[PDB]
A paper describes a structure:
Instead, the cotranslational insertion of Sec into a nascent selenoprotein is promoted by a specialized elongation factor, eEFSec in eukaryotes and SelB in prokaryotes. eEFSec is a translational GTPase that binds Sec-tRNASec with high affinity and stringent specificity, and plays a pivotal role during decoding by delivering Sec-tRNASec to the site of translation in response to a particular in-frame UGA codon. Human eEFSec adopts a chalice-like structure composed of four domains: the N-terminal D1 (residues 1–215), D2 (residues 224–304), D3 (residues 310–455), and the C-terminal D4 (residues 477–575). The height of the chalice is ∼100 Å, while its width is variable; it is the largest at the cup (60 Å), significantly smaller at the foot (30 Å), and the smallest at the stem (20 Å). The N-terminal D1–3 folds into an EF-Tu-like structure (see below) harbouring the GTPase site and the putative Sec-binding pocket. A detailed comparison with a myriad of translation GTPases acting on the ribosome reveals that human eEFSec is a structural chimera of the general translation elongation (EF-Tu/eEF1A) and initiation (IF2/eIF5B) protein factors.
As the first step towards addressing the mechanism of decoding of the Sec UGA codon in higher organisms, we determined the crystal structures of the intact human eEFSec in complex with GDP and non-hydrolyzable GTP analogues, GDPNP and GDPCP. The isomorphous orthorhombic crystals of eEFSec:GDPNP and eEFSec:GDPCP diffracted X-rays to 3.4 and 2.7 Å, respectively, while the monoclinic crystals of eEFSec:GDP diffracted X-rays to 3.3 Å. The final models were refined to Rwork/Rfree of 0.24/0.29 (eEFSec:GDPNP), 0.24/0.29 (eEFSec:GDPCP) and 0.30/0.34 (eEFSec:GDP). The asymmetric unit in each crystal form contained either a head-to-head (eEFSec:GDPCP, eEFSec:GDPNP) or a head-to-tail dimer (eEFSec:GDP). Superimposing of eEFSec:GDP onto eEFSec:GDPNP and eEFSec:GDPCP yields r.m.s.d. values of 2.5 and 2.1 Å, respectively. The question was raised whether GDPNP is a faithful mimic of GTP when bound to Sec elongation factors. Our results unambiguously show that the GTPase site of eEFSec is the same when bound to GDPCP and GDPNP, and that both analogues trap eEFSec in the GTP-bound state. Consistent with our structural results, eEFSec binds GTP, GDPCP and GDPNP with similar affinities, while the binding affinity for GTPγS is similar to that observed for GDP; the discrepancy among analogues is likely due to spontaneous hydrolysis of GTPγS. Taken together, our data suggest that GDPNP and GDPCP are equally good analogues of GTP when bound to eEFSec and by extension to SelB, and that previous structural results on the archaeal SelB are valid.
Author numbering: 3 to 31, 47 to 67, 84 to 190, 198 to 234, 238 to 381, 407 to 475, 484 to 488, 501 to 520, ...
Write the structure that this text describes.
């Protein structure tokens, strides 16, 4: 019968049960990169506004040096189930995976794994102790009271609590505005040749048979032949679905993971004007001109930044994260002021192709794998992306950020005219280090990028 695919993701620390829990699910129904499986339960009544539900279990690596795999693979998922070793506490990458889930998941389900690894007598009041504690950490977040089930996939190296798990799952899972509205975009999980195949997940818009599909790292753009999904050929598919796509002949090595868009939808940004909200759990400073690891899409590149804030006189300005208004002014600042809204401008090393208005996560991933504190610095919408390559001249001169810089009678290069104050209640103006004075006896605003045609010092 007819079906719906929905991507539940399994995220957690290393050796928390993810792969071991994804099996337990798929059956009663390591890990160096995203791995997909799928169980089915009869489709809930509520979901017919689109009979079987098919949960696709996106399995994620735990290894801290593979965070970028997660960040990408959390955009593929609707509901994220955070699996936590119950014996060990809430570990490091776990409390990172919670951040990622906040940034990119709509709903959450905490799982307490390794139940058996506990004193059968005290078995409960520990769960109820780990449960009560989990409530507390989640309190601060948008997943205020997400479910917290205890299970055990491998009672050693039959699994408990798993049938209970799926019914809690087949209830919290929630499909968004499943619009095959906008420009089509697909994350490709596996791509191989037989034609050439692309088992990927759709993110935006629809795609009918024989449509026009661009592959950017492939340098050309083939047309869709067949579309096998639920073991049976389809004539059209849209968001949320996991799909299979046969396109013109080509080779795979030209991609292994990445993006498949509409004919022209995607950018090729060299830099971008981005909404930047800082992540609280990140201890430390976000420093204007500091090269962070930056994840934009199923792609993650190196970028130095520069932060700023709305006018001083217009801080308390609503927070708009849909477009940028290049009319207003913005005071250039040295670090993320910790300004209802604060922006920044990332200038990459290599370029980064991205769907317009995609989320961005700045992070410092040169750190140890056994790191001490969260490594995810800031997230934030990509408010605008400079497509131009020589953009610093071509387009930035359209932004108005400046650095409030500060430093015989009636007459004590490019400052020859600016009214300067002196300490005794006087005016004064530069001239020929001579200074003509009104009557008888600097606070300029250099635009950050105006020199290109103005090198201004014009202050009022
Ligand atoms: N005691 C106990 N051990 C379990 C249970 N479930 C899984 N394990 C143990 O967890 C160990 C590592 O977990 P595993 O699922 O392999 O790793 P993972 O969840 O995929 N994370 P990663 O991707 O880094 O391997 C396994 O060797 C398995 O024996 C459980 O329910 N109880």
């Amino acid at each position: 019968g007819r079906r719906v695919n929905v991507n539940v993701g399994v995220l957690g620390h290393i050796d928390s049960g993810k792969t071991a829990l994804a099996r337990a699910l798929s059956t009663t129904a390591i890990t160096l990169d995203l791995g997909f499986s799928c169980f089915s339960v009869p489709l809930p009544a509520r979901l017919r506004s689109s009979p079987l539900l098919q949960v696709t279990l996106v399995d994620c690596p735990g290894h801290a040096s593979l965070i970028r795999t997660i960040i990408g693979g959390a955009q593929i998922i609707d509901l994220m189930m955070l699996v936590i070793d119950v014996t060990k506490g809430m570990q490091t990458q776990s409390a990172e995976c919670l951040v990622i889930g906040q940034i990119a998941c709509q709903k959450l389900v905490v799982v307490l794994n390794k139940i058996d690894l506990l004193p059968e007598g005290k078995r409960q009041a520990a769960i109820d102790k780990m449960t009560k504690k989990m409530q507390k950490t989640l309190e601060n977040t948008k997943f205020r009271g997400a479910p917290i089930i205890p299970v055990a996939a491998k009672p050693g190296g039959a699994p408990q609590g798993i049938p209970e798990l799926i019914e809690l799952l087949t209830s919290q899972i929630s499909i968004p505005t499943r619009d095959p509205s906008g420009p089509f975009l697909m994350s490709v999980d596996h791509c191989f040749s037989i034609g050439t195949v692309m088992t990927g997940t759709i993110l935006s818009g629809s795609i009918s048979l024989g449509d026009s599909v661009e592959i950017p790292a492939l340098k050309v753009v083939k047309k869709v032949k067949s579309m096998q999904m639920f073991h049976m050929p389809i004539t059209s598919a849209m968001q949320g679905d996991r799909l299979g796509i046969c396109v013109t002949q080509f080779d795979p090595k030209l991609l292994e993971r990445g993006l498949v868009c509409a004919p022209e939808s995607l950018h090729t940004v060299h830099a971008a004007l981005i909404s930047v909200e800082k992540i609280p759990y990140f201890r430390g400073p976000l420093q204007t001109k500091a090269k962070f690891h930056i994840t934009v899409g199923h792609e993650t590149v190196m970028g130095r930044l520069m932060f700023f804030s709305p006018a001083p006189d217009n801080f308390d300005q609503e927070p708009i994260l849909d477009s940028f208004n290049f009319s207003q002014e913005y005071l250039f600042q040295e670090q993320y002021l910790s300004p209802r809204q604060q922006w920044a401008l990332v200038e990459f090393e290599k370029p980064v192709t991205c769907p317009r208005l995609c989320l961005v996560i700045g992070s410092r991933l040169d750190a140890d794998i056994h790191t001490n504190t969260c490594r995810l610095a800031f997230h934030g919408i990509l408010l605008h992306g400079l497509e131009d390559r020589n953009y610093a001249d071509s387009f930035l001169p359209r932004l108005k950020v400046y650095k409030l810089k500060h430093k015989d009678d009636y007459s004590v290069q490019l400052f020859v005219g600016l009214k300067v104050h002196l300490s005794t209640g006087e005016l004064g103006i530069i001239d020929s280090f001579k200074i003509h004075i009104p009557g008888g006896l600097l606070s300029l605003t250099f635009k950050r990028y105006v020199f290109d045609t103005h090198k201004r010092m014009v202050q009022s």
